[PDB]
Design a protein around this motif. Structure first.
Motif, PDB file in Angstrom:
ATOM      1  N   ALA A  47      34.278  45.310  26.684  1.00 26.93           N
ATOM      2  CA  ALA A  47      34.918  45.433  27.993  1.00 26.93           C
ATOM      3  C   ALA A  47      33.986  46.282  28.861  1.00 26.93           C
ATOM      4  N   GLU A  48      33.522  45.725  29.974  1.00 32.85           N
ATOM      5  CA  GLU A  48      32.636  46.482  30.850  1.00 32.85           C
ATOM      6  C   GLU A  48      33.323  47.737  31.389  1.00 32.85           C
ATOM      7  N   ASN A  49      34.624  47.625  31.643  1.00 28.81           N
ATOM      8  CA  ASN A  49      35.409  48.736  32.198  1.00 28.81           C
ATOM      9  C   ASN A  49      36.827  48.883  31.655  1.00 28.81           C
ATOM     10  N   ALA A  50      37.424  47.801  31.167  1.00 27.99           N
ATOM     11  CA  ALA A  50      38.839  47.831  30.793  1.00 27.99           C
ATOM     12  C   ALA A  50      39.297  48.693  29.646  1.00 27.99           C
ATOM     13  N   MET A  51      38.368  49.248  28.882  1.00 28.35           N
ATOM     14  CA  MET A  51      38.741  50.128  27.773  1.00 28.35           C
ATOM     15  C   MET A  51      38.296  51.580  27.972  1.00 28.35           C
ATOM     16  N   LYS A  52      37.844  51.889  29.180  1.00 24.34           N
ATOM     17  CA  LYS A  52      37.469  53.255  29.527  1.00 24.34           C
ATOM     18  C   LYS A  52      38.737  54.110  29.695  1.00 24.34           C
ATOM     19  N   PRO A  53      38.584  55.436  29.610  1.00 19.69           N
ATOM     20  CA  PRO A  53      39.778  56.278  29.739  1.00 19.69           C
ATOM     21  C   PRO A  53      40.663  56.030  30.945  1.00 19.69           C
ATOM     22  N   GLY A  84      34.411  48.532  21.062  1.00 18.79           N
ATOM     23  CA  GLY A  84      35.321  49.250  21.957  1.00 18.79           C
ATOM     24  C   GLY A  84      34.524  50.295  22.728  1.00 18.79           C
ATOM     25  N   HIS A  85      34.578  50.197  24.046  1.00 21.90           N
ATOM     26  CA  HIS A  85      33.849  51.108  24.939  1.00 21.90           C
ATOM     27  C   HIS A  85      34.865  51.630  25.966  1.00 21.90           C
ATOM     28  N   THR A  86      35.182  52.932  26.010  1.00 22.88           N
ATOM     29  CA  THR A  86      34.672  54.021  25.176  1.00 22.88           C
ATOM     30  C   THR A  86      35.812  55.070  25.171  1.00 22.88           C
ATOM     31  N   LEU A  88      35.629  58.496  25.052  1.00 21.98           N
ATOM     32  CA  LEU A  88      35.383  59.739  25.802  1.00 21.98           C
ATOM     33  C   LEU A  88      34.113  59.575  26.625  1.00 21.98           C
ATOM     34  N   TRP A  89      34.163  60.010  27.878  1.00 22.89           N
ATOM     35  CA  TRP A  89      33.032  59.954  28.787  1.00 22.89           C
ATOM     36  C   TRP A  89      33.361  60.959  29.901  1.00 22.89           C
ATOM     37  N   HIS A  90      32.357  61.328  30.688  1.00 25.35           N
ATOM     38  CA  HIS A  90      32.558  62.252  31.816  1.00 25.35           C
ATOM     39  C   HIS A  90      32.760  61.466  33.118  1.00 25.35           C
ATOM     40  N   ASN A  91      32.566  60.146  33.079  1.00 26.11           N
ATOM     41  CA  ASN A  91      32.862  59.299  34.235  1.00 26.11           C
ATOM     42  C   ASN A  91      34.048  58.396  33.844  1.00 26.11           C
ATOM     43  N   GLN A  92      34.706  57.859  34.865  1.00 24.61           N
ATOM     44  CA  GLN A  92      35.841  56.952  34.675  1.00 24.61           C
ATOM     45  C   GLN A  92      36.863  57.505  33.692  1.00 24.61           C
ATOM     46  N   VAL A  93      37.156  58.790  33.894  1.00 19.75           N
ATOM     47  CA  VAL A  93      38.128  59.537  33.099  1.00 19.75           C
ATOM     48  C   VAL A  93      38.996  60.250  34.126  1.00 19.75           C
ATOM     49  N   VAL A 144      32.050  58.700  21.704  1.00 19.16           N
ATOM     50  CA  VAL A 144      31.650  59.520  22.839  1.00 19.16           C
ATOM     51  C   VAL A 144      30.474  58.800  23.491  1.00 19.16           C
ATOM     52  N   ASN A 145      30.415  58.923  24.800  1.00 17.78           N
ATOM     53  CA  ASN A 145      29.405  58.265  25.623  1.00 17.78           C
ATOM     54  C   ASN A 145      28.694  59.291  26.484  1.00 17.78           C
ATOM     55  N   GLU A 146      27.369  59.259  26.477  1.00 20.57           N
ATOM     56  CA  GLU A 146      26.547  60.103  27.340  1.00 20.57           C
ATOM     57  C   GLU A 146      26.804  61.598  27.261  1.00 20.57           C
ATOM     58  N   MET A 220      22.357  52.667  21.451  1.00 18.59           N
ATOM     59  CA  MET A 220      21.279  52.829  22.415  1.00 18.59           C
ATOM     60  C   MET A 220      21.594  51.870  23.566  1.00 18.59           C
ATOM     61  N   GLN A 221      22.027  52.415  24.699  1.00 19.79           N
ATOM     62  CA  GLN A 221      22.352  51.567  25.859  1.00 19.79           C
ATOM     63  C   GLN A 221      21.254  50.552  26.258  1.00 19.79           C
ATOM     64  N   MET A 222      20.022  51.021  26.301  1.00 24.85           N
ATOM     65  CA  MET A 222      18.884  50.166  26.632  1.00 24.85           C
ATOM     66  C   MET A 222      18.838  49.615  28.059  1.00 24.85           C
ATOM     67  N   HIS A 223      19.133  50.483  29.016  1.00 26.20           N
ATOM     68  CA  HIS A 223      19.012  50.076  30.419  1.00 26.20           C
ATOM     69  C   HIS A 223      17.526  50.311  30.686  1.00 26.20           C
ATOM     70  N   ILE A 224      16.723  49.321  30.328  1.00 29.61           N
ATOM     71  CA  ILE A 224      15.284  49.438  30.479  1.00 29.61           C
ATOM     72  C   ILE A 224      14.800  48.942  31.836  1.00 29.61           C
ATOM     73  N   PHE A 291      24.316  42.565  25.886  1.00 28.28           N
ATOM     74  CA  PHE A 291      23.819  42.582  27.275  1.00 28.28           C
ATOM     75  C   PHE A 291      24.911  43.149  28.186  1.00 28.28           C
ATOM     76  N   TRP A 292      24.503  43.984  29.153  1.00 28.79           N
ATOM     77  CA  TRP A 292      25.494  44.595  30.035  1.00 28.79           C
ATOM     78  C   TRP A 292      25.765  43.747  31.264  1.00 28.79           C
ATOM     79  N   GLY A 293      26.405  42.610  31.005  1.00 32.42           N
ATOM     80  CA  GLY A 293      26.754  41.688  32.067  1.00 32.42           C
ATOM     81  C   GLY A 293      26.381  40.269  31.676  1.00 32.42           C
ATOM     82  N   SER A 299      25.866  41.744  37.654  1.00 33.60           N
ATOM     83  CA  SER A 299      25.282  42.958  37.083  1.00 33.60           C
ATOM     84  C   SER A 299      25.690  44.183  37.892  1.00 33.60           C
ATOM     85  N   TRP A 300      25.891  45.292  37.190  1.00 36.56           N
ATOM     86  CA  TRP A 300      26.261  46.547  37.836  1.00 36.56           C
ATOM     87  C   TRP A 300      25.103  47.192  38.615  1.00 36.56           C
ATOM     88  N   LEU A 301      23.872  46.725  38.418  1.00 37.40           N
ATOM     89  CA  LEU A 301      22.738  47.329  39.125  1.00 37.40           C
ATOM     90  C   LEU A 301      22.801  46.951  40.614  1.00 37.40           C
TER      91      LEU A 301
HETATM   92  O1  LIG Z   1      31.164  48.204  36.541  1.00 36.09           O
HETATM   93  C1  LIG Z   1      30.357  49.357  36.264  1.00 36.09           C
HETATM   94  C2  LIG Z   1      29.982  49.356  34.791  1.00 36.09           C
HETATM   95  O2  LIG Z   1      29.051  48.296  34.521  1.00 36.09           O
HETATM   96  C3  LIG Z   1      29.318  50.661  34.397  1.00 36.09           C
HETATM   97  O3  LIG Z   1      29.160  50.636  32.974  1.00 36.09           O
HETATM   98  C4  LIG Z   1      28.329  51.711  32.509  1.00 36.09           C
HETATM   99  C5  LIG Z   1      26.864  51.315  32.581  1.00 36.09           C
HETATM  100  O4  LIG Z   1      26.059  52.400  32.100  1.00 36.09           O
HETATM  101  C6  LIG Z   1      26.309  52.674  30.712  1.00 36.09           C
HETATM  102  O5  LIG Z   1      25.989  51.528  29.912  1.00 36.09           O
HETATM  103  C7  LIG Z   1      27.767  53.070  30.530  1.00 36.09           C
HETATM  104  O6  LIG Z   1      28.033  53.337  29.144  1.00 36.09           O
HETATM  105  C8  LIG Z   1      28.664  51.963  31.048  1.00 36.09           C
HETATM  106  O7  LIG Z   1      30.035  52.366  30.944  1.00 36.09           O
HETATM  107  O8  LIG Z   1      30.192  51.754  34.704  1.00 36.09           O
HETATM  108  C9  LIG Z   1      30.403  51.827  36.125  1.00 36.09           C
HETATM  109  C10 LIG Z   1      31.179  50.599  36.566  1.00 36.09           C
HETATM  110  O9  LIG Z   1      31.397  50.675  37.982  1.00 36.09           O
END
Ligand SMILES: O[C@@H]1[C@@H](O)[C@H](O[C@@H]2CO[C@H](O)[C@H](O)[C@H]2O)OC[C@H]1O
Length: 324
Positions: A47-53, A84-86, A88-93, A144-146, A220-224, A291-293, A299-301
């Protein structure tokens, strides 16, 4: 419209590891080309976002699992495993975690924040286990993330401020107790660069595992980027793998630094080929590549970009062909 007759990406790696993708719950209908691309090419989902805190417990005690469950249902329907992502994190909490409930101008105590962390982790893991049982597709969680900063020290988030450095160990303890069948990961970015952060991740996991913390893997996220050095990625994987933990590439994409020219797409193809040759060579350690997307258009970039194997028109790019 997608190309239905080209090779299913994940099938190319069946003797190596599952190939997954991070998705949005709004892109899962049968008639949606993004969903078609998802089901065709990947055998793992995140889940790109749906399982965050914030996505699971927006206000205290008010759990919102519908979007997460929709993704799980889809994974089950398409025979996909999940990460499952994630937890605990300091963002989206949500801010409520860190506030004294009687006086929101003040911080929660160490005991209160730990109890809230335990309740959140336990409720999240118990939800998937009780609702899906043996069909739960999730094989592990980014517990835990980041948690490291870019100098390799522990990130000074509200978790660290209120609780102290052992909050990491506690998150793993709570997750392990809630569901011992889950593989538990610590996830982070820039740890593929073989710099101070890679060393710090190695040092932290070595320390925690020696203390009995139930950490099973390093994500390893791997945002290269188009300029990433493969030698550094190889050295990082070897160093982290020496700890006897699984390694998963959890959020792969390639930042093009604004250059989306045809020449750049060819350079991206050569780099992705080298990257996947490396992952294959390290199959004894790597247990998933995600892959993140699904495609460049989602893509979130920030734009302009062309980070993935499928372009903004959902077509296979030179990098896809280079890899298969
Ligand atoms: O929609 C975006 C998400 O793609 C973004 O996801 C982050 C990307 O950076 C790391 O991989 C992190 O672990 C992911 O949660 O989070 C912001 C959201 O707006």
């Amino acid at each position: 419209t997608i190309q239905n007759d080209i090779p299913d990406l994940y099938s190319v790696f069946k003797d190596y590891f599952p190939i997954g993708v991070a998705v949005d719950p709004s892109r899962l209908n049968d008639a949606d080309p993004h969903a078609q691309l998802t089901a065709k090419h990947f055998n793992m989902l995140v889940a790109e976002n749906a399982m965050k805190p914030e996505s699971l417990q927006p206000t205290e005690g008010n759990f919102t699992f519908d979007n997460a469950d929709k993704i799980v249902d889809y994974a089950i329907a398409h025979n996909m495993k999940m990460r499952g992502h994630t937890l605990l994190w300091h963002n989206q909490v949500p801010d409520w975690f860190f506030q004294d409930p009687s006086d929101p101008s003040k911080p929660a105590s160490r005991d209160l924040l730990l109890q809230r962390l335990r309740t959140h982790i336990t409720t999240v893991l118990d939800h998937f286990k009780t609702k899906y049982g043996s069909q739960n597709p999730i094989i592990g969680w980014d517990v835990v993330n980041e948690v490291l900063d870019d100098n390799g020290n522990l990130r000074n988030s509200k978790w660290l401020q209120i609780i102290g450095p052992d909050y990491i160990e506690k998150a793993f303890e709570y997750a392990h107790e809630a569901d011992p069948s889950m593989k538990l990961f610590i996830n982070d970015y820039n740890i593929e660069n073989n710099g101070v952060k890679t060393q710090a991740m190695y040092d932290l996991v070595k320390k925690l595992k020696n203390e009995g913390v139930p950490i099973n893997g390093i994500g390893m996220q791997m945002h290269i980027s188009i300029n990433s050095n493969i030698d550094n990625i190889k050295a990082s994987i070897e160093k982290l793998a020496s700890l006897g933990v699984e390694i998963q590439v959890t959020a792969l994409d390639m930042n093009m630094n604004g250059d989306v020219s045809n020449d750049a797409l060819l350079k991206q193809a050569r780099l992705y080929k080298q990257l996947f040759d490396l992952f294959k060579a390290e199959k004894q350690y790597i247990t998933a590549v995600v892959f993140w997307g699904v495609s460049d258009d989602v893509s979130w970039l920030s734009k302009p970009n062309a980070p993935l194997l499928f372009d903004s028109k959902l077509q296979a790019k030179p990098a896809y062909w280079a890899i298969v």
